[PDB]
């Protein structure tokens, strides 16, 4: 039974993420092998959509940050509207409701599995760095346990 | 399946715990039924003394402190030879050269599980209240994952 107990870990990234946040969103996004995401888990606030089980594919992951994520990189995103990002990338956010995002990898035997993303929906919001520190911490723990449970 | 998977989350606890406090040993201290202490896991920096596989009976936790610690007690000792111990408590840690001490407790389903605990043996050492969360936290969410894989 270790499909079940996969999910079991990955609810309990996001409920604990939300809770270490008070943020409205906290997802497991997951990679196939065309690094497509596909929101696995998700804790989210009432009256706020629901992003489980939706598939979004973003090529900017493939074609430019695959490996700068398996080495640590994140993004940390205080308000999107001022970030200087396309409407192509705007675009397949709103239907989520996203206005500020805290992105860190998600990193099982040296590859990139998938990324643990936080969102504000409606206002914009400053990461202070224990929080970016606490978060990242999150999912390297969730990360080794689901490398040693194969 | 059970055990085994266990086990791989206690040897991700102490691995994590390690490098988190660049300590000298964490343990994970696992209580039976008389809340007798066996070391199920460890991360030990070469050169010391390895815990792993004993089986400690020191009786204050079932007589004194199975409470506190279900509460969320944390004990830090920053220097074990000037903390008042009696030499019989004294005798369970110099064989195993510990100077300084950090105690978390694991509670599962409500019950006291086990206690994780760092060791310094190379110095005494302050805890400092920022490692102090962040092994506290390991040790929930660690704790977390074992409630769920029921
Ligand atoms: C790269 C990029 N995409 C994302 C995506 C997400 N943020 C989230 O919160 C979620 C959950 C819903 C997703 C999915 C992030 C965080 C990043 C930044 C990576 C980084 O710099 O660290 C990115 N994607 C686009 C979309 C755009 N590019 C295209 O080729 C096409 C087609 C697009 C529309 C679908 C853009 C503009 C970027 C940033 C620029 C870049 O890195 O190439
Ligand atoms: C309570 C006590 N024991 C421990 C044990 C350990 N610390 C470690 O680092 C390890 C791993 C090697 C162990 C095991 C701790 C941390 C505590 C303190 C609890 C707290 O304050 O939260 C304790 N045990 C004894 C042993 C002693 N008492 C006896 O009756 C007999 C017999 C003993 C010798 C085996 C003592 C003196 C204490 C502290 C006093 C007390 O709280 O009662
Ligand atoms: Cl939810
Ligand atoms: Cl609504
Ligand atoms: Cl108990
Ligand atoms: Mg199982
Ligand atoms: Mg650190
Ligand atoms: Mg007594």
Redesign the interface.
Same mark, same amino acid.
């Given at each position: 039974? %270790?499909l079940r107990?996969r999910q079991?870990?990955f %609810? *309990?990234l996001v409920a604990?993420g939300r809770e270490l946040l008070a943020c409205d969103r906290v997802i497991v996004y997951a990679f196939d092998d065309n690094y497509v995401g596909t929101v696995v888990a998700e804790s989210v606030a009432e009256g706020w959509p629901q992003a489980r089980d939706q598939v979004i594919e973003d090529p900017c992951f493939r074609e430019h940050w695959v490996e700068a994520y398996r080495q640590g990189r994140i993004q940390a995103t205080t308000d999107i509207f001022k970030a200087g990002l396309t409407e192509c990338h705007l675009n397949q956010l709103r239907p989520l409701k996203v206005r500020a995002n805290l992105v860190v990898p998600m990193v099982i035997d040296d590859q990139l599995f998938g990324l643990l993303i936080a969102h504000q929906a409606s206002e914009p919001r400053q990461w202070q760095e224990?929080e970016i520190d606490?978060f990242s %911490?999150?999912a390297? *723990?969730?990360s #080794?346990?689901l490398e040693? #449970?194969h």
């Open positions: 039974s %270790e107990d079991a870990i %609810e *309990t604990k224990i606490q %911490e999150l390297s *723990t969730g #080794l346990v040693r #449970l």
